[PDB]
């Protein structure tokens, strides 16, 4: 189906990330607070749920 070390390059921009619980944002995986202003820089972060 696909080369097994051209998948760690394709997953990095859509799969290995973090999310605001309060405004559904996308941020880099090594965060603590949301970036945006709408949630008021909250620290209710959680990771992007994996595929099966």
């Amino acid at each position: 189906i696909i080369e097994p070390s051209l998948r760690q390059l394709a997953q990095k921009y859509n799969c290995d990330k973090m999310i605001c619980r309060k405004c559904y944002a996308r941020l880099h995986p090594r965060a603590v607070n949301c970036r945006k202003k709408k949630c008021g820089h909250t620290n209710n972060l959680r990771p992007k749920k994996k595929v099966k």
Binding site: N14, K50, V51
Partner: protein, 94 residues
């Protein structure tokens, strides 16, 4: 992941054509900038190569192609098809 993407260039570097990505019929065009030279590698297959004397102008040109290829309608943890950045550094080495 099925439909190989065919990339072909013009204007000795300044324009880029992108065909058959997912098997779409429409043909994308991207324009890199002035003072930056696009290409196709000699040692790898589907390898674009983005040169030039400025980090900003170069890296914005990287990012136009990378955001020509973004999936609509569909779960993006599964279809992982595009053109995305590999190696940064320098044109010659010391």
């Amino acid at each position: 992941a099925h439909f190989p993407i065919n990339v072909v260039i013009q204007e000795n570097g300044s324009l880029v054509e992108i065909r058959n990505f997912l098997g779409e019929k429409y043909i994308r065009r991207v324009r890199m900038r002035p003072g930056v030279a696009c290409s196709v590698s000699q040692a790898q297959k589907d390898e674009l190569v983005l040169e030039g004397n400025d980090i900003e102008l170069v890296s914005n040109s990287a990012a136009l192609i990378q955001q020509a290829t973004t999936v609509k309608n569909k779960d993006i943890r599964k279809f992982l098809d595009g053109i995305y950045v590999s190696e940064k550094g320098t044109v010659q080495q010391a």
